[PDB]
Write a protein that binds this ligand. Structure first.
Ligand code: HEM
Length: 121
């Protein structure tokens, strides 16, 4: 296995309640192994709304992210977040701007994997 699907749910700051941020990421994501390193690849819908995003492990280490696909037409963006096997969540901090309802906000949420990122290959 070079990769495997991994489902997740983005949940609200301070609880296990689903966050409506979950509605703007494709499901499942994917765990990808390259050489000795692991990536969580995920697709952001309504990419133009995500003005900033940072991901952290549960020990508050910022995780490197790369853009691997920007699709202007579909308004999506595919990103690779650096992870390790064993992570059960990521903390996200995002700056979201929604024109139609004049919204400009920063939020913190926690993305919860269906299970610990597995070792592969
Ligand atoms: C499609 C246009 C969107 C509309 C009309 C919308 C609307 C709203 C409204 C009215 C609230 C409650 C007030 C507030 O705290 O701001 C809210 C909360 C929130 N929104 Fe959005 N939103 C949109 C897109 C997004 C996107 C793309 C994200 C990022 C993935 C996002 C993430 C959040 C988060 C994290 C909250 C806090 C409550 C929760 O965690 O569910 N929203 N949104």
């Amino acid at each position: 296995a070079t990769s495997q699907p991994i489902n997740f749910q983005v949940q609200k700051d301070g609880s296990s309640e689903k966050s409506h941020m979950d509605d703007y990421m494709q499901h499942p994501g994917k765990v990808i192994k390259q050489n000795n390193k692991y990536y969580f690849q995920t697709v952001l819908n309504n990419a133009s709304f995500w003005k900033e995003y940072k991901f952290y492990n549960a020990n508050n280490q910022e995780l490197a992210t790369t853009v691997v696909n920007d699709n202007k037409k579909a308004d999506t963006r595919t990103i690779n977040v650096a992870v390790e096997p064993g992570y059960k969540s990521l903390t996200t901090k995002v700056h979201i701007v929604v024109p139609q309802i004049n919204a400009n906000h920063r939020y913190t949420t926690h993305l919860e994997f269906e299970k610990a990122i597995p070792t592969l290959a």
